[PDB]
Amino acid sequence: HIDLSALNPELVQAVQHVVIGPSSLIVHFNEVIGRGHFGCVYHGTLLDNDGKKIHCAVKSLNREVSQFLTEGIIMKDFSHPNVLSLLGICLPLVVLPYMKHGDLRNFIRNETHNPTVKDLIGFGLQVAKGMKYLASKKFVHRDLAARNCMLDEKFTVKVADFGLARDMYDKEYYSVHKLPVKWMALESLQTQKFTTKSDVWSFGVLLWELMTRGAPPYPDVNTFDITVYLLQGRRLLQPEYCPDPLYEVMLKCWHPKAEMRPSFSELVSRISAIFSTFIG
Numbered sequence: 001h002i003d004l005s006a007l008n009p010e011l012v013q014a015v016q017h018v019v020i021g022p023s024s025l026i027v028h029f030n031e032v033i034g035r036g037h038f039g040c041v042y043h044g045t046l047l048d049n050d051g052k053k054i055h056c057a058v059k060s061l062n063r064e065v066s067q068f069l070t071e072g073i074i075m076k077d078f079s080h081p082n083v084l085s086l087l088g089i090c091l092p093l094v095v096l097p098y099m100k101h102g103d104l105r106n107f108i109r110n111e112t113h114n115p116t117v118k119d120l121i122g123f124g125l126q127v128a129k130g131m132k133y134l135a136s137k138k139f140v141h142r143d144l145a146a147r148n149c150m151l152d153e154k155f156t157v158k159v160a161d162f163g164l165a166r167d168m169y170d171k172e173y174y175s176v177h178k179l180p181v182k183w184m185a186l187e188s189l190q191t192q193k194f195t196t197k198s199d200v201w202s203f204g205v206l207l208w209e210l211m212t213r214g215a216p217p218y219p220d221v222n223t224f225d226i227t228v229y230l231l232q233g234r235r236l237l238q239p240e241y242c243p244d245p246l247y248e249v250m251l252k253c254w255h256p257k258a259e260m261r262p263s264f265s266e267l268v269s270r271i272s273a274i275f276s277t278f279i280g
C-alpha cells in the first residue's frame with residue numbers, strides 16, 4: 001500500500017510516473033536470466049501508456065516503503081545513454097530495460113564475440129561518460145566493476161548495479177570484513193568510506209579488466225591481504241594489448257592521494273583521445 005503522506009511533500013506528484021500498474025506488466029517466472037543475493041531477475045513485457053510492447057528485465061527482492069519509493073523516484077530522474085535507467089516499480093518488482101548482451105565482464109570473456117582493442121577502449125569510454133553523469137549528480141556508485149555494467153542490443157554500455165538494481169551479482173568478489181576489496185581504493189579498505197574518487201580507483205581496475213578481456217584482478221592475493229599487497233608499492237601490471245597512455249591513465253586512477261586522481265570528465269577527455277588514434 002502507498003501512503004503519499006509519509007513521503008516528502010515535494011515528491012508526491014513523482015509517484016504516478018514511477019509506479020507501474022500490475023496490469024501493464026507481464027513477467028515470465030519460468031526463465032531466470034540473472035541471480036542476485038537479494039533476488040532473481042526475469043524476462044518481462046511492459047505495456048506503455050499508449051500501448052507499446054517493450055522488452056524489460058524484472059528483478060525480485062525475494063531473498064520503509066516511503067524510503068523505497070523515494071529511492072525509485074531519484075533513480076527515474078537519472079537519464080543518460082551510458083547509465084541503466086529505471087522503468088518503474090510494480091506492486092515489489094523492480095522493472096529495468098532489458099540488456100540483451102548481459103554484463104560487460106561476461107561479454108568480453110565470451111569466445112564467440114571478438115571486440116578489437118579500439119572496441120574495448122570504447123567500452124571504457126562509455127563507462128567513463130556514464131560515471132561522469134553520475135558524479136555530476138553527486139552519486140557515488142561504491143561498486144563499479146565490469147560485472148556491474150551492462151550492454152544493450154546496440155552494444156551500448158551502461159553503468160548499472162545501482163539504486164534499486166544494486167545487488168551482489170557475483171558473490172565470489174565480495175569479502176565479509178561484504179566488500180568488493182579488489183576494486184576498492186586504499187583509503188576505502190582502511191575506512192570503509194566511499195567517494196567519487198574511490199569510484200575513480202574502481203574505474204582504473206575496470207579498464208584493466210577490459211584490456212585483459214575479463215581476467216580476475218590480483219589472483220594470487222587472498223581477500224583483505226590486498227592492502228598489504230598494495231602498500232608494498234604494487235599495482236596491476238600492464239596488459240599486453242593495453243596502450244601505454246591507457247596504462248598511464250590506470251596509474252593515475254590508482255594515485256595514492258584520492259584528490260590527485262583524475263575526475264571522470266578528465267577520464268572522458270584522455271580516453272577519447274587514445275580511442276581516436278585507433279582504426280577498427
Ligand SMILES: COc1cnc2c(NCc3nnc4ccc(-c5ccccc5)nn34)ccnc2c1
Binds near residue numbers: 100165
Ligand atoms: C540477458 O540477461 C540479463 C540479466 N540481467 C539483467 C538485468 N539484471 C539486473 C541488473 N542491474 N544491474 C546489474 C548489473 C549486473 C547484473 C548481472 C547479471 C547477471 C550476471 C552478472 C551481472 N545485473 N544487473 C538487468 C537488465 N538486463 C538483464 C539481462
